[PDB]
Symmetry: C4
Subunit: 147 residues, 4 copies
Protein backbone atom coordinates (compact mmCIF):
# COMPACT_ATOMS: atom_id res chain seq x y z
CA UNK A 1 0.00 0.00 0.00
CA UNK A 2 3.02 2.25 0.50
CA UNK A 3 4.10 1.57 -3.08
CA UNK A 4 0.51 2.26 -4.11
CA UNK A 5 0.81 5.69 -2.51
CA UNK A 6 4.16 6.62 -4.04
CA UNK A 7 2.97 5.26 -7.31
CA UNK A 8 -0.03 7.44 -6.87
CA UNK A 9 2.15 10.40 -6.39
CA UNK A 10 4.26 9.82 -9.44
CA UNK A 11 1.10 9.44 -11.40
CA UNK A 12 -0.04 12.88 -10.34
CA UNK A 13 3.31 14.35 -11.33
CA UNK A 14 2.89 12.53 -14.63
CA UNK A 15 -0.47 14.26 -14.84
CA UNK A 16 1.27 17.61 -14.47
CA UNK A 17 3.62 16.93 -17.36
CA UNK A 18 0.66 15.82 -19.43
CA UNK A 19 -1.20 18.98 -18.48
CA UNK A 20 1.59 21.40 -19.34
CA UNK A 21 2.18 19.72 -22.69
CA UNK A 22 -1.54 20.03 -23.34
CA UNK A 23 -1.22 23.73 -22.64
CA UNK A 24 1.70 23.73 -25.06
CA UNK A 25 -0.67 22.38 -27.69
CA UNK A 26 -3.29 24.95 -26.74
CA UNK A 27 -1.16 28.05 -27.09
CA UNK A 28 0.81 26.81 -30.09
CA UNK A 29 -2.36 26.13 -32.04
CA UNK A 30 -3.67 29.49 -30.91
CA UNK A 31 -0.69 31.20 -32.50
CA UNK A 32 -1.20 29.07 -35.60
CA UNK A 33 -4.82 30.18 -35.85
CA UNK A 34 -3.80 33.81 -35.52
CA UNK A 35 -1.04 33.43 -38.12
CA UNK A 36 -3.51 31.88 -40.54
CA UNK A 37 -5.97 34.70 -39.91
CA UNK A 38 -3.31 37.24 -40.78
CA UNK A 39 -2.14 35.31 -43.84
CA UNK A 40 -5.71 35.26 -45.07
CA UNK A 41 -5.81 39.03 -44.65
CA UNK A 42 -2.53 39.32 -46.55
CA UNK A 43 -3.86 37.20 -49.40
CA UNK A 44 -7.00 39.29 -49.64
CA UNK A 45 -4.70 42.29 -49.89
CA UNK A 46 -2.75 40.69 -52.71
CA UNK A 47 -5.93 39.81 -54.60
CA UNK A 48 -7.18 43.36 -54.49
CA UNK A 49 -3.81 44.59 -55.69
CA UNK A 50 -3.55 42.22 -58.64
CA UNK A 51 -7.04 43.08 -59.81
CA UNK A 52 -6.28 46.78 -59.50
CA UNK A 53 -3.21 46.46 -61.69
CA UNK A 54 -5.22 44.47 -64.21
CA UNK A 55 -7.69 47.30 -64.62
CA UNK A 56 -4.81 49.76 -64.91
CA UNK A 57 -3.00 48.01 -67.72
CA UNK A 58 -6.14 47.24 -69.69
CA UNK A 59 -7.01 50.92 -69.60
CA UNK A 60 -3.58 52.26 -70.46
CA UNK A 61 -3.35 49.90 -73.42
CA UNK A 62 -6.69 51.03 -74.79
CA UNK A 63 -5.17 54.47 -74.43
CA UNK A 64 -2.33 53.94 -76.90
CA UNK A 65 -4.59 51.84 -79.09
CA UNK A 66 -6.93 54.81 -79.44
CA UNK A 67 -4.25 56.82 -81.24
CA UNK A 68 -4.60 54.66 -84.35
CA UNK A 69 -8.39 54.77 -84.88
CA UNK A 70 -8.55 51.28 -83.41
CA UNK A 71 -11.52 50.04 -81.39
CA UNK A 72 -11.14 49.70 -77.64
CA UNK A 73 -11.66 46.55 -75.62
CA UNK A 74 -13.80 45.77 -72.58
CA UNK A 75 -12.36 46.51 -69.14
CA UNK A 76 -12.63 44.56 -65.88
CA UNK A 77 -14.15 45.92 -62.71
CA UNK A 78 -12.26 46.93 -59.58
CA UNK A 79 -13.24 43.54 -58.14
CA UNK A 80 -12.38 41.46 -61.22
CA UNK A 81 -15.68 40.25 -62.73
CA UNK A 82 -16.78 41.20 -66.20
CA UNK A 83 -19.46 43.92 -66.01
CA UNK A 84 -23.14 43.10 -65.84
CA UNK A 85 -23.61 41.44 -69.25
CA UNK A 86 -26.83 43.40 -69.65
CA UNK A 87 -24.70 46.53 -69.48
CA UNK A 88 -23.71 47.54 -73.00
CA UNK A 89 -20.11 46.92 -74.00
CA UNK A 90 -18.17 50.07 -74.88
CA UNK A 91 -16.48 50.72 -78.23
CA UNK A 92 -16.25 54.47 -78.81
CA UNK A 93 -17.28 57.80 -77.47
CA UNK A 94 -20.80 58.28 -78.85
CA UNK A 95 -21.63 54.93 -77.27
CA UNK A 96 -21.09 56.61 -73.93
CA UNK A 97 -22.71 59.85 -75.06
CA UNK A 98 -25.94 57.92 -75.65
CA UNK A 99 -26.01 56.07 -72.33
CA UNK A 100 -28.62 56.41 -69.59
CA UNK A 101 -27.80 58.19 -66.36
CA UNK A 102 -28.32 55.24 -64.02
CA UNK A 103 -26.03 53.20 -66.25
CA UNK A 104 -23.47 55.98 -66.02
CA UNK A 105 -23.58 55.72 -62.25
CA UNK A 106 -23.33 51.94 -62.45
CA UNK A 107 -20.20 52.25 -64.56
CA UNK A 108 -18.65 54.92 -62.35
CA UNK A 109 -19.11 52.48 -59.52
CA UNK A 110 -17.59 49.69 -61.58
CA UNK A 111 -14.36 51.62 -61.93
CA UNK A 112 -14.10 52.76 -58.32
CA UNK A 113 -13.92 56.44 -59.25
CA UNK A 114 -15.98 58.86 -57.18
CA UNK A 115 -18.26 61.49 -58.70
CA UNK A 116 -20.71 64.11 -57.51
CA UNK A 117 -24.43 63.36 -57.38
CA UNK A 118 -25.35 66.77 -58.79
CA UNK A 119 -22.64 67.55 -61.38
CA UNK A 120 -23.73 65.45 -64.31
CA UNK A 121 -21.42 67.56 -66.47
CA UNK A 122 -18.26 65.72 -65.51
CA UNK A 123 -19.54 62.13 -65.50
CA UNK A 124 -19.00 61.52 -69.19
CA UNK A 125 -15.57 63.07 -69.32
CA UNK A 126 -14.35 61.28 -66.22
CA UNK A 127 -15.67 57.95 -67.47
CA UNK A 128 -13.84 58.51 -70.73
CA UNK A 129 -10.65 59.28 -68.83
CA UNK A 130 -11.25 56.12 -66.85
CA UNK A 131 -11.51 53.72 -69.78
CA UNK A 132 -8.94 55.54 -71.90
CA UNK A 133 -10.75 57.56 -74.55
CA UNK A 134 -7.87 59.98 -74.84
CA UNK A 135 -7.26 60.92 -78.49
CA UNK A 136 -7.29 64.46 -79.81
CA UNK A 137 -10.73 63.88 -81.29
CA UNK A 138 -11.67 62.41 -77.92
CA UNK A 139 -10.90 65.84 -76.50
CA UNK A 140 -12.55 67.89 -79.26
CA UNK A 141 -15.86 66.01 -79.13
CA UNK A 142 -18.64 67.55 -77.04
CA UNK A 143 -20.80 65.36 -74.83
CA UNK A 144 -24.56 65.59 -75.10
CA UNK A 145 -26.89 66.21 -72.14
CA UNK A 146 -29.25 63.60 -70.77
CA UNK A 147 -32.96 63.27 -71.45
CA UNK B 1 -9.78 4.67 1.94
CA UNK B 2 -11.80 7.85 2.41
CA UNK B 3 -8.92 9.87 0.99
CA UNK B 4 -8.75 7.33 -1.82
CA UNK B 5 -12.37 8.11 -2.63
CA UNK B 6 -12.05 11.89 -2.55
CA UNK B 7 -8.86 11.55 -4.51
CA UNK B 8 -10.67 9.42 -7.00
CA UNK B 9 -13.28 12.07 -7.44
CA UNK B 10 -10.78 14.83 -8.00
CA UNK B 11 -9.22 12.65 -10.59
CA UNK B 12 -12.54 12.50 -12.34
CA UNK B 13 -12.99 16.26 -12.22
CA UNK B 14 -9.43 16.51 -13.53
CA UNK B 15 -10.58 14.20 -16.29
CA UNK B 16 -13.34 16.65 -17.17
CA UNK B 17 -10.91 19.55 -17.52
CA UNK B 18 -8.70 17.34 -19.66
CA UNK B 19 -11.69 16.39 -21.78
CA UNK B 20 -12.93 19.91 -22.41
CA UNK B 21 -9.45 21.11 -23.33
CA UNK B 22 -9.24 18.18 -25.73
CA UNK B 23 -12.48 19.39 -27.27
CA UNK B 24 -10.87 22.82 -27.44
CA UNK B 25 -8.11 21.27 -29.51
CA UNK B 26 -10.66 19.45 -31.67
CA UNK B 27 -12.74 22.43 -32.68
CA UNK B 28 -9.83 24.85 -32.96
CA UNK B 29 -8.02 22.57 -35.37
CA UNK B 30 -11.29 22.08 -37.22
CA UNK B 31 -11.50 25.81 -37.82
CA UNK B 32 -7.86 25.81 -38.85
CA UNK B 33 -8.51 23.08 -41.41
CA UNK B 34 -11.44 25.02 -42.81
CA UNK B 35 -9.44 28.25 -42.96
CA UNK B 36 -6.67 26.47 -44.83
CA UNK B 37 -9.19 24.99 -47.24
CA UNK B 38 -10.48 28.47 -47.95
CA UNK B 39 -7.04 29.97 -48.32
CA UNK B 40 -6.18 27.27 -50.82
CA UNK B 41 -9.27 28.24 -52.79
CA UNK B 42 -8.24 31.89 -52.62
CA UNK B 43 -4.76 31.09 -53.89
CA UNK B 44 -6.15 29.09 -56.78
CA UNK B 45 -8.24 32.15 -57.58
CA UNK B 46 -5.17 34.37 -57.55
CA UNK B 47 -3.25 31.98 -59.81
CA UNK B 48 -5.98 31.98 -62.41
CA UNK B 49 -6.11 35.76 -62.27
CA UNK B 50 -2.37 36.30 -62.70
CA UNK B 51 -2.23 33.95 -65.66
CA UNK B 52 -5.20 35.68 -67.24
CA UNK B 53 -3.52 39.06 -67.00
CA UNK B 54 -0.35 37.57 -68.46
CA UNK B 55 -2.19 36.47 -71.57
CA UNK B 56 -3.84 39.88 -71.80
CA UNK B 57 -0.67 41.92 -71.74
CA UNK B 58 1.22 39.65 -74.10
CA UNK B 59 -1.59 40.02 -76.61
CA UNK B 60 -2.02 43.77 -76.29
CA UNK B 61 1.70 44.29 -76.74
CA UNK B 62 1.78 42.22 -79.91
CA UNK B 63 -1.04 44.52 -80.94
CA UNK B 64 0.99 47.74 -80.87
CA UNK B 65 4.03 45.88 -82.18
CA UNK B 66 2.05 44.90 -85.26
CA UNK B 67 1.73 48.55 -86.32
CA UNK B 68 5.41 48.68 -87.26
CA UNK B 69 5.69 45.59 -89.50
CA UNK B 70 7.32 43.80 -86.59
CA UNK B 71 6.92 40.07 -85.98
CA UNK B 72 4.67 38.94 -83.15
CA UNK B 73 5.69 36.74 -80.24
CA UNK B 74 4.26 33.52 -78.83
CA UNK B 75 1.42 33.77 -76.32
CA UNK B 76 0.71 31.73 -73.19
CA UNK B 77 -2.41 29.68 -72.64
CA UNK B 78 -5.25 30.53 -70.27
CA UNK B 79 -3.67 28.06 -67.82
CA UNK B 80 -0.07 29.26 -68.21
CA UNK B 81 1.84 26.54 -70.09
CA UNK B 82 3.44 27.14 -73.44
CA UNK B 83 1.29 25.59 -76.19
CA UNK B 84 1.80 22.05 -77.38
CA UNK B 85 5.31 22.34 -78.88
CA UNK B 86 4.11 20.29 -81.83
CA UNK B 87 1.66 23.09 -82.52
CA UNK B 88 3.24 25.55 -84.92
CA UNK B 89 4.36 28.87 -83.48
CA UNK B 90 2.58 31.90 -84.95
CA UNK B 91 4.32 34.80 -86.70
CA UNK B 92 1.90 36.41 -89.16
CA UNK B 93 -1.48 36.08 -90.72
CA UNK B 94 -0.91 33.66 -93.60
CA UNK B 95 0.55 31.28 -91.02
CA UNK B 96 -2.93 31.09 -89.55
CA UNK B 97 -4.60 31.11 -92.96
CA UNK B 98 -2.76 27.89 -93.78
CA UNK B 99 -3.58 26.03 -90.57
CA UNK B 100 -5.64 22.86 -90.24
CA UNK B 101 -9.13 22.97 -88.76
CA UNK B 102 -8.47 20.73 -85.77
CA UNK B 103 -5.48 22.89 -84.93
CA UNK B 104 -7.71 25.94 -85.16
CA UNK B 105 -10.02 24.39 -82.60
CA UNK B 106 -7.06 23.48 -80.41
CA UNK B 107 -5.90 27.08 -80.46
CA UNK B 108 -9.36 28.49 -79.82
CA UNK B 109 -9.43 26.28 -76.77
CA UNK B 110 -5.97 27.46 -75.76
CA UNK B 111 -7.19 31.04 -75.55
CA UNK B 112 -10.43 30.32 -73.73
CA UNK B 113 -12.57 31.99 -76.39
CA UNK B 114 -15.75 30.21 -77.45
CA UNK B 115 -16.70 29.61 -81.07
CA UNK B 116 -19.45 27.86 -83.00
CA UNK B 117 -18.96 24.32 -84.28
CA UNK B 118 -20.58 25.12 -87.63
CA UNK B 119 -19.44 28.68 -88.47
CA UNK B 120 -15.92 28.12 -89.69
CA UNK B 121 -16.07 31.60 -91.22
CA UNK B 122 -15.34 33.42 -87.98
CA UNK B 123 -12.66 31.16 -86.51
CA UNK B 124 -9.75 32.77 -88.30
CA UNK B 125 -10.84 36.32 -87.63
CA UNK B 126 -11.56 35.68 -83.98
CA UNK B 127 -8.24 33.92 -83.49
CA UNK B 128 -6.49 36.88 -85.06
CA UNK B 129 -8.34 39.23 -82.74
CA UNK B 130 -7.29 36.98 -79.89
CA UNK B 131 -3.55 37.05 -80.52
CA UNK B 132 -3.50 40.64 -81.73
CA UNK B 133 -3.25 40.67 -85.52
CA UNK B 134 -4.87 44.07 -85.73
CA UNK B 135 -3.15 46.23 -88.36
CA UNK B 136 -4.92 47.81 -91.31
CA UNK B 137 -3.50 45.15 -93.59
CA UNK B 138 -4.64 42.63 -90.99
CA UNK B 139 -8.14 43.90 -91.69
CA UNK B 140 -7.84 44.10 -95.48
CA UNK B 141 -6.51 40.56 -95.90
CA UNK B 142 -9.05 37.85 -96.77
CA UNK B 143 -8.88 34.47 -95.09
CA UNK B 144 -8.86 31.35 -97.22
CA UNK B 145 -11.28 28.43 -96.78
CA UNK B 146 -10.23 25.03 -95.50
CA UNK B 147 -9.53 21.92 -97.55
CA UNK C 1 -4.05 -7.09 -5.42
CA UNK C 2 -1.73 -8.87 -7.84
CA UNK C 3 -4.01 -7.92 -10.72
CA UNK C 4 -4.04 -4.40 -9.30
CA UNK C 5 -0.26 -4.34 -9.60
CA UNK C 6 -0.06 -5.70 -13.14
CA UNK C 7 -2.89 -3.47 -14.14
CA UNK C 8 -1.01 -0.65 -12.59
CA UNK C 9 2.00 -1.47 -14.68
CA UNK C 10 0.07 -1.67 -17.93
CA UNK C 11 -1.27 1.79 -17.26
CA UNK C 12 2.25 3.07 -16.74
CA UNK C 13 3.13 1.67 -20.15
CA UNK C 14 -0.07 3.20 -21.47
CA UNK C 15 1.21 6.45 -20.01
CA UNK C 16 4.39 6.09 -22.05
CA UNK C 17 2.48 5.69 -25.30
CA UNK C 18 0.40 8.70 -24.37
CA UNK C 19 3.55 10.66 -23.61
CA UNK C 20 5.36 9.87 -26.84
CA UNK C 21 2.29 10.71 -28.91
CA UNK C 22 2.09 13.99 -27.01
CA UNK C 23 5.68 14.62 -28.02
CA UNK C 24 4.62 13.77 -31.56
CA UNK C 25 2.08 16.56 -31.32
CA UNK C 26 4.68 18.91 -29.85
CA UNK C 27 7.30 18.56 -32.54
CA UNK C 28 4.84 18.32 -35.42
CA UNK C 29 3.18 21.56 -34.43
CA UNK C 30 6.62 23.08 -33.96
CA UNK C 31 7.45 22.31 -37.58
CA UNK C 32 4.08 23.69 -38.59
CA UNK C 33 4.78 26.94 -36.78
CA UNK C 34 8.15 27.24 -38.47
CA UNK C 35 6.67 26.48 -41.90
CA UNK C 36 4.05 29.16 -41.38
CA UNK C 37 6.71 31.63 -40.31
CA UNK C 38 8.63 30.98 -43.52
CA UNK C 39 5.50 31.14 -45.68
CA UNK C 40 4.72 34.51 -44.15
CA UNK C 41 8.21 35.65 -45.10
CA UNK C 42 7.68 34.33 -48.62
CA UNK C 43 4.40 36.20 -48.95
CA UNK C 44 5.98 39.42 -47.77
CA UNK C 45 8.58 38.85 -50.47
CA UNK C 46 5.89 38.41 -53.10
CA UNK C 47 4.07 41.56 -51.99
CA UNK C 48 7.19 43.67 -52.31
CA UNK C 49 7.81 42.20 -55.75
CA UNK C 50 4.32 42.85 -57.10
CA UNK C 51 4.37 46.44 -55.90
CA UNK C 52 7.78 46.95 -57.45
CA UNK C 53 6.57 45.75 -60.83
CA UNK C 54 3.53 47.99 -60.52
CA UNK C 55 5.71 51.06 -60.16
CA UNK C 56 7.83 49.89 -63.08
CA UNK C 57 5.01 49.49 -65.56
CA UNK C 58 3.26 52.70 -64.57
CA UNK C 59 6.49 54.57 -65.20
CA UNK C 60 7.37 52.92 -68.48
CA UNK C 61 3.89 53.59 -69.82
CA UNK C 62 4.08 57.27 -68.94
CA UNK C 63 7.33 57.10 -70.87
CA UNK C 64 5.78 56.14 -74.22
CA UNK C 65 2.79 58.36 -73.50
CA UNK C 66 5.12 61.34 -73.21
CA UNK C 67 6.12 61.01 -76.87
CA UNK C 68 2.71 62.27 -78.00
CA UNK C 69 2.40 65.46 -75.91
CA UNK C 70 0.05 63.57 -73.62
CA UNK C 71 -0.18 64.26 -69.89
CA UNK C 72 1.36 61.76 -67.50
CA UNK C 73 -0.44 59.94 -64.71
CA UNK C 74 0.27 59.59 -61.00
CA UNK C 75 2.64 56.84 -59.88
CA UNK C 76 2.50 54.55 -56.84
CA UNK C 77 5.16 54.40 -54.17
CA UNK C 78 7.64 51.57 -53.65
CA UNK C 79 5.33 50.33 -50.87
CA UNK C 80 2.06 50.69 -52.79
CA UNK C 81 0.14 53.61 -51.24
CA UNK C 82 -0.75 56.70 -53.18
CA UNK C 83 1.61 59.56 -52.23
CA UNK C 84 0.83 61.96 -49.43
CA UNK C 85 -2.30 63.65 -50.85
CA UNK C 86 -0.90 66.98 -49.68
CA UNK C 87 1.99 66.35 -52.04
CA UNK C 88 1.21 67.91 -55.40
CA UNK C 89 0.34 65.54 -58.22
CA UNK C 90 2.74 65.65 -61.16
CA UNK C 91 1.76 66.47 -64.75
CA UNK C 92 4.76 67.91 -66.58
CA UNK C 93 8.28 69.08 -66.14
CA UNK C 94 7.89 72.67 -64.93
CA UNK C 95 5.69 71.27 -62.17
CA UNK C 96 8.80 69.57 -60.85
CA UNK C 97 11.03 72.54 -61.67
CA UNK C 98 8.92 74.64 -59.29
CA UNK C 99 8.90 72.21 -56.37
CA UNK C 100 10.42 72.77 -52.93
CA UNK C 101 13.58 70.95 -51.90
CA UNK C 102 12.11 69.03 -48.98
CA UNK C 103 9.34 67.84 -51.27
CA UNK C 104 11.98 66.73 -53.76
CA UNK C 105 13.57 64.63 -51.05
CA UNK C 106 10.19 63.25 -50.06
CA UNK C 107 9.56 62.17 -53.63
CA UNK C 108 13.02 60.68 -54.07
CA UNK C 109 12.25 58.61 -51.02
CA UNK C 110 8.87 57.66 -52.45
CA UNK C 111 10.52 56.08 -55.46
CA UNK C 112 13.26 54.25 -53.60
CA UNK C 113 16.05 55.90 -55.60
CA UNK C 114 19.08 57.14 -53.69
CA UNK C 115 20.55 60.61 -54.12
CA UNK C 116 23.32 62.69 -52.61
CA UNK C 117 22.58 65.17 -49.83
CA UNK C 118 24.85 67.82 -51.35
CA UNK C 119 24.38 67.49 -55.14
CA UNK C 120 21.07 69.23 -55.68
CA UNK C 121 21.97 69.42 -59.37
CA UNK C 122 20.95 65.86 -60.16
CA UNK C 123 17.77 65.59 -58.09
CA UNK C 124 15.47 67.04 -60.72
CA UNK C 125 16.90 65.05 -63.58
CA UNK C 126 16.88 61.79 -61.67
CA UNK C 127 13.32 62.33 -60.51
CA UNK C 128 12.29 62.97 -64.10
CA UNK C 129 14.02 59.77 -65.17
CA UNK C 130 12.20 58.02 -62.36
CA UNK C 131 8.67 59.02 -63.34
CA UNK C 132 9.33 58.90 -67.07
CA UNK C 133 9.74 62.44 -68.37
CA UNK C 134 11.83 61.26 -71.28
CA UNK C 135 10.91 63.16 -74.46
CA UNK C 136 13.37 65.14 -76.55
CA UNK C 137 12.01 68.36 -75.09
CA UNK C 138 12.32 66.68 -71.70
CA UNK C 139 16.03 66.49 -72.43
CA UNK C 140 16.42 69.98 -73.91
CA UNK C 141 14.70 71.76 -71.01
CA UNK C 142 16.95 73.22 -68.31
CA UNK C 143 16.03 72.86 -64.65
CA UNK C 144 15.94 75.93 -62.46
CA UNK C 145 17.83 76.26 -59.15
CA UNK C 146 16.11 76.37 -55.79
CA UNK C 147 15.35 79.45 -53.70
CA UNK D 1 -13.23 -3.06 -3.91
CA UNK D 2 -15.82 -4.18 -6.45
CA UNK D 3 -16.55 -0.55 -7.29
CA UNK D 4 -12.79 -0.03 -7.50
CA UNK D 5 -12.66 -2.74 -10.15
CA UNK D 6 -15.56 -1.47 -12.25
CA UNK D 7 -14.25 2.02 -11.87
CA UNK D 8 -10.94 0.74 -13.04
CA UNK D 9 -12.49 -0.70 -16.17
CA UNK D 10 -14.40 2.43 -17.05
CA UNK D 11 -11.16 4.29 -16.72
CA UNK D 12 -9.56 1.90 -19.18
CA UNK D 13 -12.39 2.48 -21.62
CA UNK D 14 -11.90 6.19 -21.00
CA UNK D 15 -8.28 5.58 -21.92
CA UNK D 16 -9.40 4.11 -25.24
CA UNK D 17 -11.46 7.18 -26.12
CA UNK D 18 -8.52 9.35 -25.17
CA UNK D 19 -6.24 7.23 -27.33
CA UNK D 20 -8.40 7.30 -30.44
CA UNK D 21 -8.87 11.05 -30.18
CA UNK D 22 -5.10 11.35 -29.88
CA UNK D 23 -4.83 9.38 -33.09
CA UNK D 24 -7.36 11.79 -34.55
CA UNK D 25 -4.98 14.60 -33.70
CA UNK D 26 -2.06 12.65 -35.16
CA UNK D 27 -3.52 11.97 -38.58
CA UNK D 28 -5.29 15.31 -38.89
CA UNK D 29 -2.08 17.21 -38.26
CA UNK D 30 -0.33 14.87 -40.66
CA UNK D 31 -2.72 15.89 -43.41
CA UNK D 32 -2.22 19.51 -42.42
CA UNK D 33 1.54 19.16 -42.73
CA UNK D 34 1.17 17.60 -46.16
CA UNK D 35 -1.25 20.30 -47.30
CA UNK D 36 1.17 22.98 -46.17
CA UNK D 37 4.00 21.25 -48.00
CA UNK D 38 1.99 21.28 -51.21
CA UNK D 39 0.87 24.89 -50.74
CA UNK D 40 4.51 25.86 -50.34
CA UNK D 41 5.24 24.11 -53.62
CA UNK D 42 2.34 25.94 -55.25
CA UNK D 43 3.60 29.29 -54.00
CA UNK D 44 7.08 28.60 -55.31
CA UNK D 45 5.42 27.86 -58.64
CA UNK D 46 3.59 31.17 -58.56
CA UNK D 47 6.76 33.08 -57.71
CA UNK D 48 8.62 31.63 -60.65
CA UNK D 49 5.71 32.47 -62.92
CA UNK D 50 5.39 36.10 -61.82
CA UNK D 51 9.10 36.69 -62.25
CA UNK D 52 9.00 35.10 -65.69
CA UNK D 53 6.22 37.41 -66.82
CA UNK D 54 8.14 40.38 -65.42
CA UNK D 55 11.12 39.61 -67.62
CA UNK D 56 8.80 39.14 -70.58
CA UNK D 57 7.07 42.48 -70.34
CA UNK D 58 10.23 44.43 -69.64
CA UNK D 59 11.75 42.98 -72.78
CA UNK D 60 8.76 43.47 -75.04
CA UNK D 61 8.48 47.09 -73.95
CA UNK D 62 12.11 47.78 -74.72
CA UNK D 63 11.22 46.28 -78.07
CA UNK D 64 8.66 48.92 -79.05
CA UNK D 65 10.75 51.60 -77.40
CA UNK D 66 13.63 50.73 -79.72
CA UNK D 67 11.61 51.82 -82.76
CA UNK D 68 11.95 55.48 -81.77
CA UNK D 69 15.73 55.73 -81.23
CA UNK D 70 15.06 55.62 -77.50
CA UNK D 71 17.47 54.04 -75.03
CA UNK D 72 16.57 50.69 -73.52
CA UNK D 73 16.23 49.91 -69.83
CA UNK D 74 17.79 47.25 -67.62
CA UNK D 75 16.10 43.86 -67.43
CA UNK D 76 15.59 41.52 -64.47
CA UNK D 77 16.92 38.00 -64.30
CA UNK D 78 14.87 34.82 -64.56
CA UNK D 79 15.01 34.65 -60.75
CA UNK D 80 14.19 38.31 -60.09
CA UNK D 81 17.37 39.98 -58.79
CA UNK D 82 19.05 42.81 -60.61
CA UNK D 83 22.14 41.51 -62.45
CA UNK D 84 25.55 41.46 -60.84
CA UNK D 85 26.14 45.21 -60.39
CA UNK D 86 29.69 44.70 -61.62
CA UNK D 87 28.17 43.53 -64.88
CA UNK D 88 27.83 46.49 -67.22
CA UNK D 89 24.34 47.83 -67.78
CA UNK D 90 23.14 47.61 -71.39
CA UNK D 91 22.03 50.59 -73.49
CA UNK D 92 22.57 49.79 -77.17
CA UNK D 93 24.02 47.28 -79.53
CA UNK D 94 27.71 48.21 -79.68
CA UNK D 95 27.71 47.90 -75.89
CA UNK D 96 27.07 44.21 -76.40
CA UNK D 97 29.38 44.01 -79.41
CA UNK D 98 32.25 45.09 -77.14
CA UNK D 99 31.56 42.67 -74.30
CA UNK D 100 33.82 39.86 -73.10
CA UNK D 101 32.94 36.24 -73.80
CA UNK D 102 32.61 35.11 -70.19
CA UNK D 103 30.29 38.04 -69.58
CA UNK D 104 28.27 36.96 -72.60
CA UNK D 105 27.86 33.54 -71.05
CA UNK D 106 26.94 35.10 -67.72
CA UNK D 107 24.21 37.11 -69.41
CA UNK D 108 22.92 34.17 -71.42
CA UNK D 109 22.56 32.39 -68.12
CA UNK D 110 20.83 35.40 -66.61
CA UNK D 111 18.08 35.20 -69.20
CA UNK D 112 17.57 31.45 -69.05
CA UNK D 113 18.20 30.98 -72.77
CA UNK D 114 20.39 28.08 -73.83
CA UNK D 115 23.29 28.42 -76.26
CA UNK D 116 26.01 26.24 -77.72
CA UNK D 117 29.48 26.19 -76.18
CA UNK D 118 31.18 26.22 -79.58
CA UNK D 119 29.01 28.50 -81.77
CA UNK D 120 30.05 31.93 -80.62
CA UNK D 121 28.47 33.30 -83.79
CA UNK D 122 24.93 33.23 -82.46
CA UNK D 123 25.51 34.46 -78.90
CA UNK D 124 25.33 38.14 -79.72
CA UNK D 125 22.29 37.88 -81.93
CA UNK D 126 20.39 35.70 -79.50
CA UNK D 127 21.21 38.00 -76.60
CA UNK D 128 19.95 40.93 -78.62
CA UNK D 129 16.74 39.05 -79.37
CA UNK D 130 16.49 38.31 -75.67
CA UNK D 131 16.67 41.89 -74.42
CA UNK D 132 14.77 43.35 -77.36
CA UNK D 133 17.24 44.99 -79.73
CA UNK D 134 14.92 44.54 -82.67
CA UNK D 135 14.96 47.63 -84.91
CA UNK D 136 15.81 47.57 -88.59
CA UNK D 137 19.24 48.98 -87.82
CA UNK D 138 19.46 46.32 -85.12
CA UNK D 139 19.16 43.81 -87.94
CA UNK D 140 21.49 45.55 -90.40
CA UNK D 141 24.35 45.94 -87.91
CA UNK D 142 27.09 43.29 -88.00
CA UNK D 143 28.50 41.90 -84.77
CA UNK D 144 32.25 41.88 -84.26
CA UNK D 145 34.27 38.78 -83.31
CA UNK D 146 35.91 38.33 -79.94
CA UNK D 147 39.56 38.89 -79.07
Amino acid sequence: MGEWKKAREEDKEWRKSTDERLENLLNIVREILDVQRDMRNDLSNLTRKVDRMDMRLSRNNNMIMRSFRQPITEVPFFNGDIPDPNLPRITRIEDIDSLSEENCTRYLKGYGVSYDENDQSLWKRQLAKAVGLTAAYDASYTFSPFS
